[PDB]
Design a protein around this ligand. Structure first.
Ligand SMILES: *[C@@H]1O[C@H](CO)[C@@H](O[C@@H]2O[C@H](CO)[C@@H](O[C@@H]3O[C@H](CO)[C@@H](O)[C@H](O[C@H]4O[C@H](CO)[C@@H](O)[C@H](O)[C@@H]4O)[C@@H]3O)[C@H](O)[C@H]2NC(C)=O)[C@H](O)[C@H]1NC(C)=O
Ligand SMILES: *[C@@H]1O[C@H](CO)[C@@H](O[C@@H]2O[C@H](CO)[C@@H](O[C@@H]3O[C@H](CO)[C@@H](O)[C@H](O[C@H]4O[C@H](CO)[C@@H](O)[C@H](O)[C@@H]4O)[C@@H]3O)[C@H](O)[C@H]2NC(C)=O)[C@H](O)[C@H]1NC(C)=O
Ligand SMILES: *[C@@H]1O[C@H](CO)[C@@H](O[C@@H]2O[C@H](CO)[C@@H](O[C@@H]3O[C@H](CO)[C@@H](O)[C@H](O[C@H]4O[C@H](CO)[C@@H](O)[C@H](O)[C@@H]4O)[C@@H]3O)[C@H](O)[C@H]2NC(C)=O)[C@H](O)[C@H]1NC(C)=O
Ligand SMILES: *[C@@H]1O[C@H](CO)[C@@H](O[C@@H]2O[C@H](CO)[C@@H](O[C@@H]3O[C@H](CO)[C@@H](O)[C@H](O[C@H]4O[C@H](CO)[C@@H](O)[C@H](O)[C@@H]4O)[C@@H]3O)[C@H](O)[C@H]2NC(C)=O)[C@H](O)[C@H]1NC(C)=O
Ligand SMILES: *[C@@H]1O[C@H](CO)[C@@H](O[C@@H]2O[C@H](CO)[C@@H](O)[C@H](O)[C@H]2NC(C)=O)[C@H](O)[C@H]1NC(C)=O
Ligand SMILES: *[C@@H]1O[C@H](CO)[C@@H](O[C@@H]2O[C@H](CO)[C@@H](O)[C@H](O)[C@H]2NC(C)=O)[C@H](O)[C@H]1NC(C)=O
Ligand SMILES: *[C@@H]1O[C@H](CO)[C@@H](O[C@@H]2O[C@H](CO)[C@@H](O)[C@H](O)[C@H]2NC(C)=O)[C@H](O)[C@H]1NC(C)=O
Ligand SMILES: *[C@@H]1O[C@H](CO)[C@@H](O[C@@H]2O[C@H](CO)[C@@H](O)[C@H](O)[C@H]2NC(C)=O)[C@H](O)[C@H]1NC(C)=O
Ligand code: FSI
Ligand code: FSI
Ligand code: FSI
Ligand code: FSI
Ligand code: CA
Ligand code: CA
Ligand code: CA
Ligand code: CA
Lengths: 388, 388, 388, 388
């Protein structure tokens, strides 16, 4: 087997088609299913896998009230084939309350962070063995992507942040070869706060659309040069911004360079990708809550500051239903690299207080060059049927 | 690995021998088992798999009352090795309330339809990745086979219908190479309504026996030319007709060309296959309800209009027990291609109102050139033992 | 991969060492586990598998009272890696209320019998596909080994019986190549009733020790010539007889040729094997009940009529605990062919009437040329802890 | 595939990073999970596996009260991929109330001991088949490592003891090739009592750090020469001793040669390894009970008698939480051999009397040359939530 290079053009898409759904919460009401959050998807050259951070317990289990605490030492990274729900035979890949995974064409890399808030440890596991680790550099919740990292020619890159969630922090970009950290580059450019990057190969480099939790409801962009390890950053140009919370479309702005200072504090993990001058992006339907999920293309959304012309909208989850984090993954086709995304569908607390737990299921869509219709694919569980 | 061509003669059979049974409903009373319907079987060159459409829930689960709704967004295509019941470790292959799957000798193709009734999306997934999609062309429940598609020399074909269930509809035959739709042919010939085709390789082409839900209790035939994409269609000649409902054997008719207008509306998925001038077919034992299941050979059933001489009858499910959909699959042997079939055994509503749910198990038989005896292999669950 | 020939000398053993135990019934009290009986073990060239006939239900399930009926259509052959208990992910290999399985070095053959008592069907499945079938020849419970068949150079042989359980019956020996019956030889020689043969390779042929359910408490022997399909038969010489029921050791007899007419009616599946003039054998400890299990070597037990000198006794299951069927399997080592055996440990009815069900677990031992101690490895479940 | 030689230098580590956690007891409160104790980890050249001794039952099961008995015949060795908790699909590898396992680069060896206390049998299973066995030599609980054995160039070695737990016993070192015992060496040197060795490759030989259950709270060392089968033994030099119970750090002693006679009776399985003159070791935090777990490097801990200067301490489990046995395993990297360890986290009796059962989960760390922070990774179950 050979290293992935992702050296094909990006597929030219017309929108997205349904790919996968796991129905986790519905199943949890009649079977033993892990409590999870922060899911994602990543694929080896043959097939796709679903990942999530467990809470060290199943849902129908008194230990499920444990999700009221943050970053417990019992959180572990779960990994199944995509569409296999997180049942009791699921492998816990490492100890993690924050993670990223990717396959370099030869083997899986897992980046797993656990331990104390002020002194966390990131473990780097490659091809089934621990190869490296790094300790917290800012003593304030070392944390990473919660979606797939990206590898080109045997070098995998991952974005990590340590420091304040509501002010300037310390973001670094790691370059990793067979599990071994070979270089670390500081964030550079005009992005002022970076969390939870959704990254994709854009040969010869890697591009990330992230979450600014401090001053911006526009999403930051991080560009990674894999050849010289140099970094650049900015903000998505689109005047239809991708973060939650955010202003209404009539009063939202982005200048491509600075955080917009519009309902900038807080946010949610999300994604977008460029296609020439245009932008494909997803976001919650609600401007203030993690409710609903929609995708669309913004004409000039990559290149034109404050562009607000959209086309090819699709509802993924209607606004009567809960969403959550979302992220990108890339899949190599015969002649092009396709872009796909997942949406975390969060159930339980804080929105639904009948139960004590918080968990999620997922829905997954992939780019298509064909045609499609409409629908809505929410979590689907009846909260009144659930164990509390 | 090499593309399948199915270029061997059809096995000369004397009837069918028991192959598989999954006991799903019996097991559901003491274990966590998916609620399903519309099952089928398809085999890669090494082994066979059972498929079904899940309802996003297990049976012993309050969400099992969801089956009262049609085509929910939570239906997913399940795929296990044949004989492995649909337990919680079952992979959900795609989102689907209608589906077809087949292996071309190199990889699996899955055709998965979901979304709104008036604007559905069919996704085409090949070798673990989404390759294509098509949207509804008639805005009225885009739908497909609910049994295996067929591939010859790397081209797979599948029959899809969109439009009225009780009147003229729009049926199309798709030709797909490695997940990519390369050609679409409209239905041609004398078949007037086509649903749920049970298709098999008949080298150099593909032959399907289908369900006419509008005017015929005789089953329509669709012939697919894989070399020039041309289509023909007609009706099974046999005067012993295969659909349910239908007239009794003394008053049923077919002229090979037109729907018979005998209890023609409504119907059930079924199968038959030609052997020279003769026909092997299955059908429910009851002429009005999905009760019982029998197979037999009709002498002249393929070539002679209204032929009613049968031989080699076998009871598969006695008439005191419920059946359901049934379909064909083909299995390559050393020197010939064998034909097999599955029968869906539906339990719960509408016939059994003690429970709110509807689900099924399966029984599976394969052609044999040897000898055999008698039996009856029904679902076997006691409705009074079930969770409601 | 190449066909097995088993062309190595038999290992020279000193007794048996513990190999495997599945604890099925203990686990059934806290998990969803199949109801089974008639288990056995067989190994491919790399690893071993446990088989049993399911009852179409788990134990903690109201359908478990179904074991009061014989040969139900819901019985299926289960197959897991040895030591993996029969949980809900277990594959049902075929429909069967009587079975035999073996690997020819290239693929698995399964012989599966199901259907009506007076008109049963045996299916022959090889390399994942149905290859042949045969119908009942005496219209009285067509039945087979309930342990592994044996293959040499691509020809597998299996012993089958049809007819009375308490009088002369019709026993036939089938020779099968890649699932296809190529020859059938009638039983010949002096064995007068044959059931449930435990067969092993004894290159260039196959030897079976069986159960005479009619007139003998000594066990019949069947010798199979794989080169010309000829058959011979007789009785184990040992005056320490292997069947249950049987006379006390002080009044039991065998002349090597005829059934002994000592508590001859009824019996239990069992095994023995020759080593020169000596015999290794197992049997229940109780002379009249399926209680306990012991093994030993009989000096002159193969060649000397009525020999009663034993040595190297081991208790496998003490006489305070239930046993059941037992059978042989063979495992190829570096320089010799080893002999192993399993013991079925039956719990529930008829002996234990607190519950309505009947099921079993297994314990498995293999020949050793080393040393060993003592113990007892019974089922271990507390009947008072079980669901009824 | 080729035999492992472990002929690389030992990785130069700075401490340990989190590798795995299984959350067994938390999961047992909401799912069917095996009752276990004496777990360990061992890896084939591709990936790691977790092992433990089952108690023939799940936890939420009335049979879980069976742990009050020692060495029941129902104990079996369980083996899953690391991080897959012991669910009902877990393979029971052999019958064992004491065990050791290792992979020689080609296949797995399992050493499994079961049977009567005064007359036990050790079975040796290699590449899926029983190859050898040995009986008790001192008639007093034949027993072995409860962690991985070690293989060099196709010869695996394992340390076994038979005899008193509180006085002089009979310890032997076995050398095994493809499952076959080829040589047995008696213990030699100054170690006076040896139990539960934690062994690692130190090319060209094998080194073990063990438990002295009689007179020492300092840990004995056993050195194994794989070239001539010669044996040496002594005690870990470090004045910070590794056994529990032990004296406090201000009053503990070791002279490298003799048991220290400081709270010497009783003990717990543990580990350490040399790096030049220094020592890496783990131990419970409590000096009297199996509470907490810590690791550190002792400067001169390998070469200098009574050395007590430590550095690089890490808390693995804080002292408010229960621990248990711990042991080493080794993992081959690109250029060096890494050392890892697991900690058994015991819940239930005798410390927690609310429940009748005793079970464990595990946490696993691996050596790192990178950096790391702090945390505590205990079992995490709420005893009040558990089935009793
Ligand atoms: C059957 O399904 C198809 C495919 O999903 C669907 O066609 C799509 O319809 C939507 C909605 O009309 C189109 O997306 C729009 O494009 C226009 C530009 O042409 C934009 O102005 C729209 O954005 C505005 O309106 C949105 C609400 O619709 C607002 O949320 C938004 O803020 C803007 O104000 C929107 O992006 C899409 O392009 C087509 N897709 C294609 C490929 O044609 C069709 O309508 C469905 N048919 C039926 C009857 O349901
Ligand atoms: C043991 O099993 C064997 C194999 O299953 C079985 O032999 C089969 O019997 C059936 C029933 O007699 C045969 O099928 C019939 O063939 C005749 C033509 O010769 C047809 O006329 C029959 O159809 C009519 O009768 C049916 C009811 O039997 C009606 O349902 C139908 O509408 C028609 O009116 C029927 O097809 C079959 O050919 C044989 N098979 C073989 C290979 O011989 C045998 O009977 C069983 N033994 C016992 C004791 O019953
Ligand atoms: C530790 O374990 C070993 C190995 O299991 C064990 O040694 C074995 O003891 C048995 C019993 O003594 C031996 O088997 C006997 O062999 C004699 C011939 O020498 C036979 O006469 C015996 O049969 C008679 O007695 C049986 C009851 O023991 C009756 O059931 C039977 O009907 C006969 O009357 C019996 O076969 C066996 O040979 C040895 N094995 C070896 C290899 O030495 C040993 O006794 C155990 N030690 C302790 C203290 O438990
Ligand atoms: C963030 O995490 C890092 C890495 O874990 C951590 O640094 C470590 O701190 C410990 C504790 O200070 C160091 O280990 C000590 O080393 C000194 C020698 O310099 C020893 O004297 C210590 O042993 C004594 O004290 C222990 C309690 O701390 C007693 O249990 C013991 O019996 C002795 O009395 C101890 O071994 C360790 O070397 C560093 N590791 C590294 C790589 O620097 C750091 O402290 C954490 N940050 C914060 C804010 O705490
Ligand atoms: C799970 O945890 C929650 C707390 O996070 C527990 O709920 C509390 O219960 C106490 C007493 O029963 C109440 O006084 C509190 O008001 C509850 N807290 C909340 C926020 O609801 C719950 O009891 C725990 N589960 C179990 C089984 O003990
Ligand atoms: C599952 O759904 C069915 C309806 O589809 C529910 O049954 C209804 O229950 C209400 C109140 O009990 C009755 O008034 C209706 O007559 C019922 N409808 C039918 C058609 O039976 C059922 O309650 C649901 N399951 C649960 C646990 O709520
Ligand atoms: C399972 O089957 C048994 C019969 O085989 C049922 O037990 C019978 O129950 C009836 C009425 O409850 C009694 O009159 C009989 O005496 C019982 N038979 C025996 C042999 O005990 C049992 O009820 C069935 N299980 C369930 C849940 O219905
Ligand atoms: C599991 O075993 C324990 C004993 O090991 C049982 O507990 C005993 O129960 C009896 C009667 O309830 C008491 O008299 C004893 O004092 C108990 N012994 C101890 C040490 O607690 C327990 O009942 C068993 N489990 C079940 C369900 O029977
Ligand atoms: C998300 C979330 O908002 O739902 O927040 C993350 C951080 O709190 C946030 O990005 C601010 O820094 C959590 N990550 C960690 C490491 O705590 C996510 O788990 C998730 F909670
Ligand atoms: C079968 C059924 O009758 O049992 O009907 C199908 C259609 O309703 C019918 O063929 C009329 O068009 C259902 N298919 C879809 C897409 O709804 C089947 O699911 C099944 F319900
Ligand atoms: C055994 C048994 O005695 O326990 O009996 C078999 C036969 O009844 C017996 O050999 C007489 O013919 C059963 N086999 C079949 C096919 O019924 C076994 O299942 C078993 F029941
Ligand atoms: C450990 C333990 O202390 O927790 O003790 C072992 C021995 O009892 C001890 O080493 C004294 O000889 C047990 N081993 C056996 C074979 O019983 C362990 O299982 C474990 F119990
Ligand atoms: Ca923000
Ligand atoms: Ca019809
Ligand atoms: Ca008899
Ligand atoms: Ca000690």
């Amino acid at each position: 087997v050979e290293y992935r290079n992702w050296s094909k053009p990006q597929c030219q898409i017309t929108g997205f088609a349904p790919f996968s759904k796991d129905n986790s919460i519905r199943l949890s009401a009649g079977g033993d299913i892990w409590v999870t959050r922060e899911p994602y998807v990543s694929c080896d050259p043959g097939k796709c896998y679903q990942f999530a951070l467990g809470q060290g317990t199943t849902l129908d289990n008194k230990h499920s009230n444990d999700t009221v605490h943050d970053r417990i030492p019992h959180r572990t990274l779960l990994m199944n084939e995509l569409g296999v729900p997180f049942h009791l035979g699921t492998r816990q890949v490492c100890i993690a309350w924050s993670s990223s995974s990717c396959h370099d064409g030869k083997a899986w890399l897992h980046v797993c962070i656990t331990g104390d808030d002020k002194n966390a440890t990131a473990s780097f596991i490659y091809d089934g063995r621990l190869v490296d680790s790094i300790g917290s550099w800012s003593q304030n919740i070392l944390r990473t992507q919660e979606s797939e990292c990206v590898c080109i020619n045997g070098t995998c890159t991952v974005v990590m942040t340590d420091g304040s969630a509501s002010g300037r922090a310390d973001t670094r970009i790691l370059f990793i070869e067979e599990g071994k950290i070979v270089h670390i580059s500081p964030l550079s450019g005009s992005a002022q706060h970076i969390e939870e990057c959704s990254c994709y190969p854009r040969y010869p480099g890697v591009r990330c659309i992230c979450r600014d939790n401090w001053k911006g409801s526009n999403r930051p962009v991080v560009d990674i040069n894999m050849e010289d390890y140099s970094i650049d950053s900015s903000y998505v140009c689109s005047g239809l911004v991708g973060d939650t919370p955010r202003n209404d479309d009539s009063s939202s702005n982005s200048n491509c360079r600075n955080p917009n200072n519009e309902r900038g504090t807080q946010g949610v993990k999300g994604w977008a990708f460029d296609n020439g001058n245009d932008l494909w992006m997803g976001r919650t339907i609600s401007k203030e809550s993690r409710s609903g999920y929609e995708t669309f293309k913004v004409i000039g959304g990559w290149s034109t500051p404050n562009s607000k012309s959209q086309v090819n909208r699709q509802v993924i989850v209607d606004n009567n239903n809960w969403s959550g984090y979302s992220g990108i993954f890339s899949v190599e086709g015969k002649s092009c690299i396709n872009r796909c995304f997942y949406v975390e569908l969060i159930r339980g607390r804080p929105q639904e207080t009948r139960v004590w737990w918080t968990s999620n299921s997922i829905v997954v869509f992939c780019g298509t060059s064909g045609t499609y219709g409409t629908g809505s694919w929410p979590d689907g569980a009846n909260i009144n049927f659930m164990p509390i």
